[PDB]
Ligand binder design. Structure first.
Ligand SMILES: [Cl-]
Ligand SMILES: [Cl-]
Ligand SMILES: [Cl-]
Ligand SMILES: [Cl-]
Ligand SMILES: [Cl-]
Ligand SMILES: [Cl-]
Ligand SMILES: [Cl-]
Ligand SMILES: [Zn+2]
Lengths: 191, 17
């Protein structure tokens, strides 16, 4: 069925909090109908299919997320299912036109290597950029702590978008680094 | 180090048992 917004993360020093918007039953039903009448708020949406859940981040009026989460699926919306505007399987990246009411991040232009990752539990954790698509976690955490966060944003100190979280680099269940899709690839995907 | 994917189960607060 469709991807369904089931909660959101609202960003403020960078702080974040989460709010549930849908229960499990309404989620399954909304997935089948593709029709979602709820108001959307926040920069990050917690999204779910019938089988898995993850995050989507809105940057410049597009809601972006990971292909391994969303596949080719539509996003449930007020006028029915929304077709993907961008589908880049190789970069593991999909996008839908952002619901009205979602607040867009703007892409980072400062080039800072001092980043923050916002997790599914609305924790904001320090990351050090280590190249185009990798950052080290300055404080390693169990991978369990990052479960459900695929598609979440990496932010620079000014709260602009650097990338979206794709995968964790792990040894023995401890996440030491993150792999991400740089905001540049969103620009390349678009134009 | 190897790549782990971080999908959880369905719903806002996925049920684990
Ligand atoms: Cl629930
Ligand atoms: Cl609901
Ligand atoms: Cl209707
Ligand atoms: Cl609805
Ligand atoms: Cl799925
Ligand atoms: Cl699919
Ligand atoms: Cl773990
Ligand atoms: Zn910046």
């Amino acid at each position: 069925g469709s991807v369904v917004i089931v909660g959101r993360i609202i960003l403020s020093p960078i702080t974040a909090y989460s709010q549930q918007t849908r229960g499990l039953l309404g989620c399954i039903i909304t997935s089948l109908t593709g029709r979602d009448r709820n108001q959307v708020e926040g920069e990050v949406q917690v999204v779910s299919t019938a089988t898995q859940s993850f995050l989507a981040t809105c940057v410049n009026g597009v809601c972006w997320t990971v292909y391994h989460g969303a596949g080719s699926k539509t996003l449930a919306g007020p006028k029915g299912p929304i077709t993907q505007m961008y589908t880049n399987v190789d970069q593991d990246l999909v996008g839908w036109q952002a619901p009205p009411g979602a607040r867009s991040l703007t892409p980072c232009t400062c080039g800072s290597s001092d980043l923050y990752l916002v997790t599914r539990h609305a924790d904001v954790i320090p990351v050090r950029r280590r190249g185009d698509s990798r950052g080290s976690l300055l404080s390693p955490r169990p991978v369990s702590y990052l479960k459900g966060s695929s598609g979440g944003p990496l932010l620079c100190p000014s709260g602009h978008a650097v990338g979206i979280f794709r995968a964790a680099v792990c040894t023995r269940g401890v996440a030491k680094a993150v792999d991400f899709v740089p905001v540049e690839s969103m620009e390349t995907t678009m134009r | 180090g190897r790549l782990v994917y971080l999908l959880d189960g369905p719903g806002y607060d996925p049920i684990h048992c």
